[PDB]
Amino acid sequence: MHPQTLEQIKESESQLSGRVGMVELDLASGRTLSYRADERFPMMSTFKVLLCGAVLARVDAGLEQLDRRIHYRQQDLVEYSPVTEKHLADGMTVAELCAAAITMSDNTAANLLLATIGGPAGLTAFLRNIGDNVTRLDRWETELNEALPGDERDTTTPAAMAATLRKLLTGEILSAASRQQLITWMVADKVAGPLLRSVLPAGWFIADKTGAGERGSRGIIAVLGPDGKPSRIVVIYLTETQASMDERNQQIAEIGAALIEHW
């Protein structure tokens, strides 16, 4: 038993004594539920879905290949690189790196793919070219998770994120096969268990990507729906709190439960 979603968000924000942003966007109708929709939040690892979107655009155009192998050095490793550190000798394909970046949130994998599209400014240009004038990436992993208040670097707004995900995952920017490939990596997410997944009824579709950052930051972007098909995009960001991590998970889960109850 939960209050209406917006009311649950207010209560969660109070408990965390922080800042919470949300957009629920219905794919068919364009109906939205929103809260702080136009305020900036740090993306943290949620940016990795955009990164892979830009890589797949280059695959579509013949400039990149998914089976291309990339070799890197022990020097190139940053903190939290659970997949990439296992393949130091043999390297990884572009496709393998996308899967690592999305399913495990491997940081070195993200930085490797970033280098292929022209770094942070490369991703930001891609975004501008597809009609997003808000979202911006300025730094690499792991500096981009610093989440200083008032700092506009490595931020998006819930409204802009939701709109961009709608274009990438369900629009005409990527080919049919690339769209499906991006969603498939999201469905296979291995590190988002304690969040939306923990309150999701049986039979429901979910494809998500999580983020965490400094200053009590946590986020999640998701495509979800009843009866095994995606029907809405959900973006949740929270920041500027001193809450424990699994306390931040719990509040996201709670907002999720209200969202599902009052679907």
- The data reach a resolution, in angstroms, of 2.4
CA distance 165 to 232: 11
For residue 194, count other CB atoms closer than 10 A to its CB. Answer: 16
CB 32 within 8 A of CB 25: yes
Q: Measuring CA to CA, how many Å separate 49 from each of 12, 64, 209?
A: 26, 17, 7
CA distance 119 to 188: 26
Q: Where are the beta strands (DSSP E) in 4-160?
A: 19-26, 32-35, 41-42, 69-70, 92-93, 155-156
Residue 132 Cα to chain centre, angstroms: 16
Does 45 participate in catalysis according to the annotation?
A: yes
Place of tokens 């979107």: 53
For residue 232, count other CB atoms closer than 10 A to its CB. Answer: 21
For the CA atoms of 207, 119, 67, 127, what is the dihedral angle to 10 degrees?
Answer: 50
* Burial class of residue 53, CB neighbours in 10 A (0-12, 13-18, 19+): buried
Does 143 participate in catalysis according to the annotation?
A: yes
Enumerate residues 6+ apart whose C-beta is below 8 A from 43. Answer: 135, 137, 144, 154, 155, 156, 161, 211, 219
Q: Measuring CA to CA, how many Å separate 173 from each of 96, 136, 155, 243?
A: 22, 19, 22, 38
CA distance 24 to 18: 20
Place of tokens 């730094």: 139
Which method was it determined by? X-ray
210 in the Ramachandran plot: left (φ > 0), alpha (ψ -120 to 50) or beta? beta
> Looking at 12, 45, 105, 178, which residue is catalytic?
45
* Burial class of residue 190, CB neighbours in 10 A (0-12, 13-18, 19+): exposed
Smallest CA-to-CA distance from 56 within 138, 188, 168 is with 168
The kind and range of the H/E element at 139 are none
Q: Measuring CA to CA, how many Å separate 139 from each of 116, 136, 144, 251?
A: 15, 9, 5, 28
CB 234 within 8 A of CB 9: no
Domain spans of the chain?
A: 1-263
CB 68 within 8 A of CB 93: yes
Helix runs in 130-198, H state only? 158-170, 176-187
Smallest CA-to-CA distance from 57 within 116, 107, 100 is with 116
* CATH 3.40.710.10 given to domain 1-263: yes
CB 51 within 8 A of CB 226: no
CA distance 40 to 107: 23
> Looking at 85, 143, 152, 214, which residue is catalytic?
143
> How does strand 69-70 pair with strand 19-26?
unpaired
CA distance 94 to 52: 10
Going edge to edge, which strands form the sheet with 232-239?
32-35, 19-26, 232-239, 217-225, 205-213
CA distance 156 to 65: 29
CB 177 within 8 A of CB 72: no
